[PDB]
Amino acid sequence: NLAPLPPHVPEHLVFDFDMYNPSNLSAGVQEAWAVLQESNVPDLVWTRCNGGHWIATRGQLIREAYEDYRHFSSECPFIPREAGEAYDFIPTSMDPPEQRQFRALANQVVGMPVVDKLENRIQELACSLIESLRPQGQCNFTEDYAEPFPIRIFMLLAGLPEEDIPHLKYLTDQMTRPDGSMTFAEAKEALYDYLIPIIEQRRQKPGTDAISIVANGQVNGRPITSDEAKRMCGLLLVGGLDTVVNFLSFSMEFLAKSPEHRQELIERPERIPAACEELLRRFSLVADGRILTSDYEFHGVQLKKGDQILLPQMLSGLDERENACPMHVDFSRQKVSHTTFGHGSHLXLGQHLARLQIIVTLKEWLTRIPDFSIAPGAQIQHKSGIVSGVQALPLVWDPATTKAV
């Protein structure tokens, strides 16, 4: 239900948006969140859902809050409070000064030099999967590509067996879009239960994989601890298993529904990177937040120490104050403004990997299957959370229109 309204919150600021089951979900997730930017809604609102918390609804406030880590701490970055309290991943649960030293280590395993080394295998995997689907004239895109394409690459990078994917994917999903079977704390402890023996093993006998690299790594010139390594490796798993996996499906749902936009990319494939950026804006999908370190008056609103504030990364690029006609996809948009990969000191460090995976998927798919549609009669369902997603995406095409390459 709705948590009782705290005394310090004026009733005129109440807007009971449920980030885990938003009212207008049937219209699309981004559409469902964009209700927070309707004409009657203030820049900063209180929702009584999910224990009660603030929501910044506009790009300007979201950006300002991500910059001000002194007032807006990452210590408790998830809603609901019990999830944010249990959340201890590194670097995300940390503020400067201590946070930054951990970013360099994470960059060693998923940063640009690593992405370069993996790029041929990434390309190869996309081609392999797509060629196998091509003659079928149909797929369940979420499970036939959106999942295995990013996840098998992450498993390879981390040196984990592919048979472990269903278990790990289940756990990650419970931390971002819980189905009610597990609390965040339970899913976290299970993920750590998995990692503990692996980290011990790889500190004793290091390999070349990501976990070995992190577990035996150094931070600001001193050895990382087993526990710090566990808390970082957990985060890396969530990133590899539950980000681009969802994003690809939003993109592909859009392309199937939009023949005019596909054709643009078939006629002019060099536009694909710009298209990637515009889609990252339009189908932005992350929303986490921060906790107030002290009482603070922010844009005329009295925020109280300990208050949680959702700062939906998703909303910045959908904000008409940041981009004209924001629900329209324009691959030639001149200034594509978004905070899809975050803002401030916690900027996504997986973004080279993410962009490569998106760009590769678009290029390799459109080359082989230029003409495809949503299965006739299908209604695409979505699920909202910390990272939002597509429940299923049945696609169809005429094999005669495809090219084996």
Ligand code: HEM
């Ligand atoms: C479309 C794909 C992705 C999106 C939209 C995305 C989004 C984000 C966002 C919004 C943040 C900031 C969180 C915050 O400020 O609290 C973040 C941080 C982070 N992301 Fe990504 N991400 C994506 C892919 C990836 C991938 C593939 C990885 C690979 C491991 C990854 C690893 C990380 C890490 C390690 C951080 C923490 C940085 C820090 O706290 O200093 N992300 N990401």
Ligand SMILES: CC1(C)[C@@H]2CC[C@@]1(C)C(=O)C2
């Ligand atoms: C918000 C994120 C996308 C970012 C990387 C994975 C994620 C769910 C986190 O816990 C930090």
Ligand SMILES: [K+]
């Ligand atoms: K915490």
